[PDB]
Design a protein around this ligand. Sequence first.
Ligand SMILES: Cc1csc(Nc2ncccc2OCc2ccccc2)n1
Ligand SMILES: OC[C@H]1O[C@H](O)[C@H](O)[C@@H](O)[C@@H]1O
Length: 448
Amino acid sequence: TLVEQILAEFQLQEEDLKKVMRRMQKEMDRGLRLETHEEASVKMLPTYVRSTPEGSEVGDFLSLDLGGTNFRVMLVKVGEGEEGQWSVKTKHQMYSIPEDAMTGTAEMLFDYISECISDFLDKHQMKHKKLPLGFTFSFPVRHEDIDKGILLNWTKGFKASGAEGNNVVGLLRDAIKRRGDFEMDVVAMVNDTVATMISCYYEDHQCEVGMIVGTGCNACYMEEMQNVELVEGDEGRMCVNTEWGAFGDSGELDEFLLEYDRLVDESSANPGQQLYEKLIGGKYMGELVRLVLLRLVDENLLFHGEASEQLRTRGAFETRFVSQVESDTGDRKQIYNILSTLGLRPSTTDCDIVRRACESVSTRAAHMCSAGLAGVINRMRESRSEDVMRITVGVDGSVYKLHPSFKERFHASVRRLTPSCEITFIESEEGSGRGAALVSAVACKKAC
Ligand SMILES: Cc1csc(Nc2ncccc2OCc2ccccc2)n1
Ligand SMILES: OC[C@H]1O[C@H](O)[C@H](O)[C@@H](O)[C@@H]1O
């Protein structure tokens, strides 16, 4: 119980989740009104992807995806069926992000990006062509239009100087020119939440919410145009990027933050920001575990009180270990190897404690996240003359997909919070690429 006392600190009662759900809703409304949208912590950014688009433009599209740990380029083909349009990656390539590209300037960053875009073009002989280009850019962006928007501020640990405040699309072009090598008509720029949602629409027309639970955590949904005061118009709906990871940046989660959350924040690339996200995102889950474990050793309750050289370095405990650890079948071999690589020699109980620590952190994350999704869905519910509102959520992200239990804990908790709601979850198969192309294919029947 001495360990169960420390770990019990991560528990959240149904009432605590509802409070969180109700609070996220209050912030979503604030970010949407002209009078508070400026100091609102949940930005609720208009994305410009609209309810009923004019018509697609079949053909091959080039799609970029920047925001993960691996910048990606891919060719996707858009066609047309009864449903709507279809899409499919046909060629793809991943490129590791250098240290010199992350510390320098956005200039150098997009230059490196420019290269990868060309290297991809060589290998697949197509540099001579100029196709529409969809840009899935995973950061908060204030759009002026589907193909224009400024970077409000990096998240998840990106530093590139002189990037904030400027046009992302522009900078992308300002680099394609410093090449001449090729030409690309950068038609659309979208958030990964949105791309994921869009990619599932053609499969399920009821899909009006996109959610990402990976290195970061965020969501997007279809809002009634008249509620999007920041954008002229009251007819139809517009997708809105909630950027809910910034939830709590105004002190809305202070009564729930633990000493570990404070430490993780104090040592992050963006102290004081993306707090809600730092409770769920895989960029932090492992680190949350490392801090929990370390406390356990300093209270002489784990590893005899001796922490490895690696167990004491930041980021040493990767989020993928949390997953693996929670997959151990009971024979502890998985848990033992993980810790062994970390320079520890755990006992049977040491392994069961580490196991319990992970379940506590990932379970908190699954529940906290469930509060946000419920917040989004209940808000949408408050605009629908139906008994049972059926809605589909397009989802993507390592944590949500690869963590052995997150998915179930999360679903159960979301359903408890959403009465009269029939939620359906679909996982996106290549949601970014296919998502950008599908959007670009609609903005293209306007710019081409
Ligand atoms: C301005 C703009 C660019 S792309 C788009 N709309 C759509 N693009 C792709 C697929 C579907 C689109 O709208 C239909 C829709 C989307 C989400 C939820 C319901 C319907 N609008
Ligand atoms: O990639 C998942 C999410 O990570 C962070 O929250 C980014 O700010 C957000 O834009 C993105 O959608």
